[PDB]
Design an enzyme around this catalytic site. Sequence first.
Site, PDB file in Angstrom:
ATOM      1  N   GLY A  41       0.766  -1.233   0.000  1.00  0.00           N
ATOM      2  CA  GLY A  41       0.000   0.000   0.000  1.00  0.00           C
ATOM      3  C   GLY A  41       0.798   1.284   0.000  1.00  0.00           C
TER       4      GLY A  41
ATOM      5  N   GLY B 262       2.815   2.381  -2.499  1.00  0.00           N
ATOM      6  CA  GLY B 262       2.866   2.990  -3.813  1.00  0.00           C
ATOM      7  C   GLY B 262       3.698   2.286  -4.854  1.00  0.00           C
TER       8      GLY B 262
ATOM      9  CB  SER C 261       0.865  -1.334  -8.037  1.00  0.00           C
ATOM     10  OG  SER C 261       1.139  -2.683  -7.772  1.00  0.00           O
ATOM     11  CE1 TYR C 262      -1.413   6.702  -9.328  1.00  0.00           C
ATOM     12  CE2 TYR C 262       0.777   7.594  -8.909  1.00  0.00           C
ATOM     13  CZ  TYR C 262      -0.504   7.743  -9.401  1.00  0.00           C
ATOM     14  OH  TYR C 262      -0.855   8.936  -9.976  1.00  0.00           O
TER      15      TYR C 262
ATOM     16  N   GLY D 226       5.226  -7.154  -1.026  1.00  0.00           N
ATOM     17  CA  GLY D 226       5.357  -6.208   0.070  1.00  0.00           C
ATOM     18  C   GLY D 226       6.466  -6.516   1.068  1.00  0.00           C
TER      19      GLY D 226
HETATM   20  N1  LIG Z   1       2.267   9.057  -5.962  1.00  0.00           N
HETATM   21  C1  LIG Z   1       0.978   8.641  -5.768  1.00  0.00           C
HETATM   22  N2  LIG Z   1      -0.040   9.382  -6.313  1.00  0.00           N
HETATM   23  C2  LIG Z   1      -1.309   8.994  -6.160  1.00  0.00           C
HETATM   24  N3  LIG Z   1      -1.735   7.903  -5.488  1.00  0.00           N
HETATM   25  C3  LIG Z   1      -0.721   7.125  -4.988  1.00  0.00           C
HETATM   26  C4  LIG Z   1       0.617   7.409  -5.047  1.00  0.00           C
HETATM   27  N4  LIG Z   1       1.329   6.428  -4.362  1.00  0.00           N
HETATM   28  C5  LIG Z   1       0.422   5.623  -3.914  1.00  0.00           C
HETATM   29  N5  LIG Z   1      -0.813   6.024  -4.189  1.00  0.00           N
HETATM   30  C6  LIG Z   1      -2.128   5.323  -3.868  1.00  0.00           C
HETATM   31  O1  LIG Z   1      -1.991   4.349  -2.825  1.00  0.00           O
HETATM   32  C7  LIG Z   1      -2.586   3.044  -3.080  1.00  0.00           C
HETATM   33  C8  LIG Z   1      -1.616   1.903  -2.778  1.00  0.00           C
HETATM   34  O2  LIG Z   1      -0.391   1.791  -3.538  1.00  0.00           O
HETATM   35  P1  LIG Z   1      -0.454   1.019  -4.925  1.00  0.00           P
HETATM   36  O3  LIG Z   1       0.895   0.979  -5.554  1.00  0.00           O
HETATM   37  O4  LIG Z   1      -1.630   0.167  -5.047  1.00  0.00           O
HETATM   38  O5  LIG Z   1       0.014  -0.374  -4.177  1.00  0.00           O
HETATM   39  P2  LIG Z   1       1.281  -0.999  -3.462  1.00  0.00           P
HETATM   40  O6  LIG Z   1       2.047   0.227  -2.924  1.00  0.00           O
HETATM   41  O7  LIG Z   1       0.803  -1.977  -2.435  1.00  0.00           O
HETATM   42  O8  LIG Z   1       2.033  -1.653  -4.602  1.00  0.00           O
HETATM   43  C9  LIG Z   1      -3.271   3.187  -4.461  1.00  0.00           C
HETATM   44  O9  LIG Z   1      -4.696   3.331  -4.264  1.00  0.00           O
HETATM   45  C10 LIG Z   1      -2.754   4.559  -5.068  1.00  0.00           C
HETATM   46  O10 LIG Z   1      -3.805   5.352  -5.670  1.00  0.00           O
HETATM   47 MG   LIG Z   2       0.725  -3.343  -5.688  1.00  0.00          MG
END
Ligand SMILES: Nc1ncnc2c1ncn2[C@@H]1O[C@H](COP(=O)(O)OP(=O)(O)O)[C@@H](O)[C@H]1O
Ligand SMILES: [Mg+2]
Length: 338
Positions: free
Chosen positions: A97, A99, A101-102, A246
């Site tokens: 969570g 960031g 994947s984002y 993670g």
């Molecule tokens: N730089 C960013 N800008 C906008 N939203 C982000 C950013 N970094 C993380 N988030 C938000 O946080 C959530 C979790 O991170 P995401 O990459 O799914 O998954 P993880 O970090 O588990 O790989 C997502 O809903 C995403 O919209």
């Molecule tokens: Mg992810």
Amino acid sequence: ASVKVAVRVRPFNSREMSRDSKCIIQMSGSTTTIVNPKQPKETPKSFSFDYSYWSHTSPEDINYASQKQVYRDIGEEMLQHAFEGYNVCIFAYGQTGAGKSYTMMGKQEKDQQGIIPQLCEDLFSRINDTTNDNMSYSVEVSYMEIYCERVRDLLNPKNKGNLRVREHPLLGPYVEDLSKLAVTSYNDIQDLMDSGNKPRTVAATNMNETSSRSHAVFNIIFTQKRHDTNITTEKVSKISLVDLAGSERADSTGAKGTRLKEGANINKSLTTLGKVISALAEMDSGPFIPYRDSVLTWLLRENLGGNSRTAMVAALSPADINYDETLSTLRYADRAKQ
Ligand SMILES: Nc1ncnc2c1ncn2[C@@H]1O[C@H](COP(=O)(O)OP(=O)(O)O)[C@@H](O)[C@H]1O
Ligand SMILES: [Mg+2]
Ligand code: VO4
């Protein structure tokens, strides 16, 4: 450089909203500081990296670090290296969570495309500009997940969970029967990872929550063939973009809800990768590694070689409630280079 490291803090998420979380992350230049919520009366602990990305607000902020920024720094550099004929590798690291994947894939929507989409687009864009009629290019792609030493083909819904990595006596490690597709356009490759991305989060993935406890590896073999009178020359580079499982799941003791074979594999994977990367860094400072210790570092051996270039982006939550694991991610990114 042979290794690049950046950290990136995101906006508060829903969990942090409900808890009225305070922000404990600060950034200036290439430096990130982290405060201890228990001792707020303290001097923040400091860390320095190649890049410290402040993405805690929104693209509305003049000093918000956007997907295009992150990519022009890290991605663009790597793809250039790839045109030179050398392998590259980009890893997203951090707690579930934070960031990861984002940062790697992002959102298909306008403005939020991650590093993979931007890199693929930039790749075909540069390729389609090739005026030299003596130039030929080929782009093959693979998309997979590594879960408990087992590989799942994300590009084919009829053979998943079961694939195993092997080692060719001469060619190197490889996943047996993994789909490797030749794509000729961006719209095309854009379909494959859209297709691979949904496979990552379909209802069934919530059984073992493979979305956050498996490593997603997007591979692209880029072959360049030049024609001159007579021999034709061939340059082949491998590009591996990865969305690691993670970091908080690296626990192999039963906490918390994570299974033994699961965290053991993840701890082993992230630990080994940490040794490989710092090893590659000590190496590039002056100017054989335990890749077998994990299926991940083993499969990517050739991308963590000597003339290979690698970059990591450590994703960070900005919340006080994640101090422990966020500090843990800063240290991990800190060791990778320092
Ligand atoms: N730089 C960013 N800008 C906008 N939203 C982000 C950013 N970094 C993380 N988030 C938000 O946080 C959530 C979790 O991170 P995401 O990459 O799914 O998954 P993880 O970090 O588990 O790989 C997502 O809903 C995403 O919209
Ligand atoms: Mg992810
Ligand atoms: O995903 V579990 O069976 O660890 O609930």
